Ligand binder design. Structure first.
Ligand code: HEM
Ligand SMILES: N#Cc1cc([N+](=O)[O-])ccc1O
Ligand code: NI
Length: 451
């Protein structure tokens, strides 16, 4: 099995001593091919990049979701919430059953008005800019997505469009995530030189948990009938066990959904706008759809569902830069991968999604081009070829929520503004376990259509 360059003792671990480890792993995959072994002191994983192998890795009878070293580190604040639980922990299937109805078609229709509330605030912010003012794209997308999960999920207003600096929750979240990613390359993690990285980590976790405390208090003291995600956390009973979630798990779910429910969607929106301004004919086509479909002062649920090409734009952004770029699996039993690589029970795999999405045998030779038309007919895509939301019963519970929000917001953006790649931005992808453009700015000229 191919393996990248080694450093003695340290095997491959120093290759992760970079601020952009996923992009480093993509370059190694380009050099070595569909599979390569990656060793660190005391741990081994196999990175997969071809649909040929990943389709086998996605066979749930043979492989289950693994908690990578990264996920074990963030389990310090995510606990046994849905994202950082093993499939076999009792709280995983319990919470899965209790929370899945919060993502039904009926539930999604119920979120729509509150999604519009935040989307209108974004559109108003940009409409109120003066001439020559820049838009800081990932920053405003993070304002939008954080506020949206807060309102729709928890009837809580972060009011991020009322701040010029990031919300304190965001600052701590980013530092906690970046600390976890930085802890993966530490050859000796208990070295005393990291003892205030460890101080800072615990302070950031307390910041997040204090916010969780307020959301729970506000719900407790609220004289308004909510039927949202938090209602189901606090009241729903698992049909199989008949049990509700306990208080400690509820706290972990709130942190999990606040983070998971906004960060990757902010990345997606930022990548989508980047590719639109870099591809003016695609932008024109999407804008024509937005103008043709969005005929009312605010979008309806059904109109968002009719934004077909906008949806294709988003899937093509997720193809090139899936914002949660890798997921981990382990072998449930001894097995052979691809007729060629024997695995023992417990062996770990890493699915490198950006490389899967560049498999030329699936997509053709032009895999670096931004062409939403690849998604004209979703049924033409082979099984396990396009996996931005993970796999099987451990796939993303929020996929439809993210895509509805992103389609709504991008539709309104395209209806209301012309965009300019004002600074000829050179793509710079920041990594914090998730992917996002850094430093991406545009200018937006209003088409002066009232809200
Ligand atoms: C474009 C946006 C998003 C992307 C790319 C994305 C991606 C993913 C991926 C790849 C996984 C599987 C992780 C693994 O196998 O270890 C996942 C799981 C999950 N996602 Fe998302 N996600 C997005 C939006 C959301 C939203 C909006 C929510 C909540 C409203 C959410 C909540 C979750 C949860 C709770 C899980 C764990 C599900 C389980 O294992 O039971 N995500 N997501
Ligand atoms: N989704 C999703 C997701 C995103 C993040 N994240 O953005 O950090 C963490 C955990 C998750 O399950
Ligand atoms: Ni309900």
């Amino acid at each position: 099995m191919p393996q990248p360059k080694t450093f003695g003792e340290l095997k491959n671990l120093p290759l992760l001593n970079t601020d952009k480890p996923v992009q480093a792993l993509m370059k190694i995959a380009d050099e070595l091919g569909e599979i390569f072994k990656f060793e660190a002191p005391g741990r081994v994983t196999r990175y997969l990049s071809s649909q040929r192998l990943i389709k086998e890795a996605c066979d749930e009878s043979r492989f289950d979701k693994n908690l990578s070293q990264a996920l074990k580190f963030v389990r310090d604040f995510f606990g046994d919430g849905l994202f950082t639980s093993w499939t076999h922990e009792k709280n995983w299937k319990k919470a899965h059953n209790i929370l899945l109805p919060s993502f039904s078609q009926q539930a999604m229709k119920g979120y729509h008005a509150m999604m519009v509330d935040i989307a209108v605030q974004l559109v108003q912010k940009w409409e109120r800019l003066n001439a020559d003012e820049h838009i800081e794209v990932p920053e405003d997308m993070t304002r939008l997505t954080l506020d949206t999960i807060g309102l729709c999920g928890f009837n809580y207003r972060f009011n991020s469009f009322y701040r010029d600096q990031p919300h304190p929750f965001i600052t701590s979240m980013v530092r906690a995530l970046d600390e976890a990613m930085n802890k993966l390359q530490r050859a000796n993690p208990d070295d005393p030189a990291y003892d205030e990285n460890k101080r800072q980590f615990q302070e950031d976790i307390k910041v997040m948990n204090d916010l969780v405390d307020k959301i729970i208090a506000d719900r407790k003291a609220s004289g308004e009938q909510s039927d949202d995600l938090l209602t189901h956390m606090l009241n729903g009973k698992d049909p199989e066990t008949g049990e509700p979630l306990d208080d400690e798990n509820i706290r972990y779910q709130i942190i999990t959904f606040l983070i998971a429910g906004h960060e990757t969607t902010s990345g997606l929106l930022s990548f989508a706008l980047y590719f639109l301004v870099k591809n003016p004919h695609v932008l024109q086509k999407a804008a024509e759809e937005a103008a043709r479909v969005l005929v009312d002062p605010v979008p309806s649920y059904k109109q968002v569902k009719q934004l077909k090409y906008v949806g294709m734009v988003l899937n093509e952004a997720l193809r090139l830069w899936p914002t949660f770029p890798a997921f981990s699996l382990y072998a449930k039993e001894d097995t052979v991968l691809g007729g060629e690589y024997p695995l023992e029970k417990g062996d770990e795999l890493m699915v490198l999604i950006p490389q899967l999405h560049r498999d030329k045998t699936i997509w053709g030779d032009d895999v670096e081009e931004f062409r939403p038309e690849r998604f004209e007919n979703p049924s033409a895509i082979p099984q396990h070829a396009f996996k931005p939301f993970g796999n099987g019963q451990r796939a993303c519970i929020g996929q439809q929520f993210a895509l509805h929000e992103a389609t709504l917001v991008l539709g309104m953006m395209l209806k209301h503004f012309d965009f300019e790649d004002h600074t000829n931005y050179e793509l710079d992808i920041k990594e914090t376990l998730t992917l996002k453009p850094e430093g991406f700015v545009v200018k937006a000229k209003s088409k002066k259509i009232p809200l």
